[PDB]
Amino acid sequence: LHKEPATLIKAIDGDTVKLMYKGQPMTFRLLLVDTPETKHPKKGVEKYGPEASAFTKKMLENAKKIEVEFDKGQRTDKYGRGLAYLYADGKMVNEALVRQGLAKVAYVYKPNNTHEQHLRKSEAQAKKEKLNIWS
């Protein structure tokens, strides 16, 4: 797997962000994690939804460099969103969210599951620390 550079356009919510990637504007969905939503008509703002979005936004807005990491499977979902691991100054946004109790590890789908163990360890620790979603 290899990291590629990208530029923040807009953070949309905790797990969806609009980037500039290879000269084009593109929406990315964070691989392997599910944050609570602030969007949905049936839903509204779920618990920790706003927390999760502000975390993603701040982390990316304050970075010196952002990189995207594609996994080994398909790279776009049925909605046209890129599927990736996002890094802010070398720190994986996807893991940070999970380590802080702001996201659950998603239903995983082979072969897009390279960082699955890693995230699952941070999730267990977050649960143990009873953080946010785990409180």
Q: Which domains does the chain have, with CATH numbers?
A: 1-135 (2.40.50.90)
Q: Please list, in sequence order, all residues whose beta carbon lies within 8 angstroms of the beta carbon of residue 45, skipping any fewer than 6 positions away.
A: 37, 38
Is residue 120 annotated as a catalytic residue, yes or no? no
Secondary structure class of 58 (helix, strand, coil): helix
Which residues define the annotated binding site for Ca(2+)?
15, 34-35
Per the CB < 8 A criterion, the answer to whether 13 and 49 are in contact is: yes
Which residues face 70 on adjacent strands?
Answer: 84
Per the CB < 8 A criterion, the answer to whether 71 and 110 are in contact is: no
Q: How far apart are CA 96 and CA 87, in angstroms?
A: 10
Catalytic one of 29, 51, 67, 95 = 29
Which tokens go with 133? 């979603």
Per the CB < 8 A criterion, the answer to whether 51 and 58 are in contact is: no
**Cα separations (Å) of 124 from 99, 101, 128?**
9, 10, 6
Is residue 75 annotated as a catalytic residue, yes or no? no
**Cα separations (Å) of 65 from 8, 25, 51, 60?**
9, 17, 23, 9
Please confirm whether the linkage preceding 5 is cis (ω < 30° from 0).
no
**Cα separations (Å) of 105 from 5, 43, 61, 64, 109?**
25, 20, 24, 27, 12
Is residue 81 annotated as a catalytic residue, yes or no? yes
Which residues define the annotated binding site?
15, 34-35
Q: How far apart are CA 104 and CA 127, in angstroms?
A: 10
Residue spans of beta strands (DSSP E) within the chain: 3-13, 16-21, 24-30, 33-34, 66-70, 82-88, 91-92, 104-105
Long-range contacts (CB closer than 8 Å, 24 or more residues apart) made by 16-23: 16/81, 17/56, 17/60, 17/86, 19/66, 19/68, 19/82, 21/68, 21/82
Which tokens go with 103? 């996201």
